[PDB]
Enzyme design. Structure first.
Site, PDB file in Angstrom:
ATOM      1  N   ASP A  42      61.511  58.979  32.449  1.00 14.89           N
ATOM      2  CA  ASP A  42      61.896  57.578  32.586  1.00 14.89           C
ATOM      3  C   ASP A  42      63.279  57.357  31.974  1.00 14.89           C
ATOM      4  OD1 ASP A  42      61.706  54.614  32.600  1.00 14.89           O
ATOM      5  OD2 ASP A  42      59.551  55.000  32.943  1.00 14.89           O
ATOM      6  N   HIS A  73      62.386  50.281  29.948  1.00 13.60           N
ATOM      7  CA  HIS A  73      61.235  50.670  30.766  1.00 13.60           C
ATOM      8  C   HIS A  73      60.564  51.917  30.221  1.00 13.60           C
ATOM      9  CE1 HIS A  73      62.182  47.629  33.690  1.00 13.60           C
ATOM     10  NE2 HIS A  73      61.073  47.949  34.334  1.00 13.60           N
ATOM     11  N   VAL A 181      49.428  64.614  43.629  1.00 12.00           N
ATOM     12  CA  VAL A 181      49.739  63.715  42.517  1.00 12.00           C
ATOM     13  C   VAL A 181      48.718  62.608  42.520  1.00 12.00           C
ATOM     14  CG1 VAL A 181      52.203  64.245  42.528  1.00 12.00           C
ATOM     15  CG2 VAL A 181      51.340  62.328  43.881  1.00 12.00           C
ATOM     16  N   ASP A 204      45.528  56.669  45.201  1.00 15.05           N
ATOM     17  CA  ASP A 204      44.279  57.198  44.679  1.00 15.05           C
ATOM     18  C   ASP A 204      43.441  56.108  44.014  1.00 15.05           C
ATOM     19  OD1 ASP A 204      44.416  60.210  45.100  1.00 15.05           O
ATOM     20  OD2 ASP A 204      46.396  59.786  44.267  1.00 15.05           O
ATOM     21  N   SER A 228      55.160  50.490  38.025  1.00 16.32           N
ATOM     22  CA  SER A 228      55.590  51.210  36.823  1.00 16.32           C
ATOM     23  C   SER A 228      54.663  50.969  35.644  1.00 16.32           C
ATOM     24  CB  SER A 228      57.025  50.796  36.403  1.00 16.32           C
ATOM     25  OG  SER A 228      57.969  51.224  37.387  1.00 16.32           O
TER      26      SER A 228
HETATM   27 CA   LIG Z   1      46.386  61.899  45.437  1.00 16.08          CA
END
Ligand SMILES: [Ca+2]
Length: 282
Positions: A42, A73, A181, A204, A228
Site C-alpha cells: 500500500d 491509506h 486470490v 469470493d 480498500s
Molecule cells: Ca477467488
C-alpha cells in the site's frame, strides 16, 4: 479463550463476530493471529502509531525515498487488519511494503517489485504457508499483474484483494481477476452491497467496507469507505484462522467462504451474498 472488545470503535469489527447486524462488541479467540505475518502492500504504514504496539515493522519501499505513510491509506488498512483498537487480528505481525506514493499512485512495475520482495521475505522468515498479503489497490486489467498475484499465492502467501470501486464486474480489474486470490467486495452496516463496489462471479465474499474507522498517520483515526477497507478485514480474519485452526495459506480463502453467512441484501446478480464471519459462535 474468548476475548471481548466492548463497544468496538468500528462497526465492521463487531459485525464479523456476529451472525446478525447491529452488534456492538467484537468477540474473538485470544490467539488473535499471533505469530502470523501480514504484508501491507500500500502507501506505507506509520509504524510508530500506538495502534500497532510495536508489532509493525518496515519492509521495503519501491515508490520513493520517504519511508513513511504520506497518504494514510496504508496505515488505515494495516490498522483494520491488525491494530490493537481498530483491528481484526490484534496480535499479528505487520510489515509495511510501500509501493504507492503520497498521492496513492504507483506503476504496475513498482507494485510487482513490492510483491516479489514480500514473497522472498516470507521464505526467509520461514513463514511459507502461514503468511498473509493485503492488496487494497487495483487497476485496469493486466496479465502481468495477474501473474504476479497468482505467484504470491503459489509461493504460500494468502492474498486478499479489493474488488474495486467502479460499480462494475471485477473480472475487468487486476489483481481482482487473478487466479486463486481472495477477492473482497464491500458491505454496509445495514448488510447491503455498497453502491460503489465491484461485483460478479470473481468475488469470493463481502466484508465491511463503508464507513470503516481505523488508525491514521500521526496518532489519530479516520473513517473511510471503499473495497480498500473491506479487504483488510479478510486479511486479518485469515491470520486469525491460521493461528487458531492451523489452516494453510492455500486453503484460507475457501475456509473463510465456508464460514461466511449468507447475509447480504440486494447483492448484484451473479454475485455471492456471503459476508465474513469469524466462526466464534458467541
Ligand atoms: Ca477467488
Amino acid at each position: 479463550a474468548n476475548v471481548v472488545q466492548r463497544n468496538s470503535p468500528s462497526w465492521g469489527l463487531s459485525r464479523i463476530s456476529s451472525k446478525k447486524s447491529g452488534a456492538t462488541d467484537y468477540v474473538y479467540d485470544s490467539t488473535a493471529g499471533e505469530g502470523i505475518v501480514i504484508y501491507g502492500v500500500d502507501t506505507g504504514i506509520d509504524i510508530g502509531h500506538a495502534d500497532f504496539g510495536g508489532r509493525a515493522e518496515w519492509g521495503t519501499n519501491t515508490a520513493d525515498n520517504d519511508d513513511t505513510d504520506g497518504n494514510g491509506h496504508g496505515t488505515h488498512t494495516a490498522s483494520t487488519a491488525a491494530g490493537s483498537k481498530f483491528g481484526v487480528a490484534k496480535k499479528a505481525s505487520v510489515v509495511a511494503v510501500k509501493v504507492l506514493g503520497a498521492d496513492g499512485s504507483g506503476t504496475n512495475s513498482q507494485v510487482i517489485a513490492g510483491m516479489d520482495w514480500a514473497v522472498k521475505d516470507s521464505k526467509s522468515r520461514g513463514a511459507t504457508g502461514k503468511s498473509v498479503m493485503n492488496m487494497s489497490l487495483g487497476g485496469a486489467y493486466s496479465r502481468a499483474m495477474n501473474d504476479a498475484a497468482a505467484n504470491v499465492v503459489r509461493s504460500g502467501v494468502f492474498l486478499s484483494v479489493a474488488a474495486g470501486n467502479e460499480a462494475q464486474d471485477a473480472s475487468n480489474s487486476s489483481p481482482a481477476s487473478a487466479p486463486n486470490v481472495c477477492t473482497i467486495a464491500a458491505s454496509t452496516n445495514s448488510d447491503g452491497s455498497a453502491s460503489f463496489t465491484n461485483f460478479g462471479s470473481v468475488v469470493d465474499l463481502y466484508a465491511p467496507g463503508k464507513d470503516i474507522t481505523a488508525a491514521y498517520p500521526g496518532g489519530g483515526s479516520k473513517t473511510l469507505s471503499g473495497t480498500s477497507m473491506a479487504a483488510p478485514h479478510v486479511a486479518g480474519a485469515a491470520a486469525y484462522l491460521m493461528a487458531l485452526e492451523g489452516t494453510t495459506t492455500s486453503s484460507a480463502c475457501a475456509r473463510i467462504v465456508q464460514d461466511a453467512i449468507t447475509k447480504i441484501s440486494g447483492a448484484p446478480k451473479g454475485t455471492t451474498t456471503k459476508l465474513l464471519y469469524n466462526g466464534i459462535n458467541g
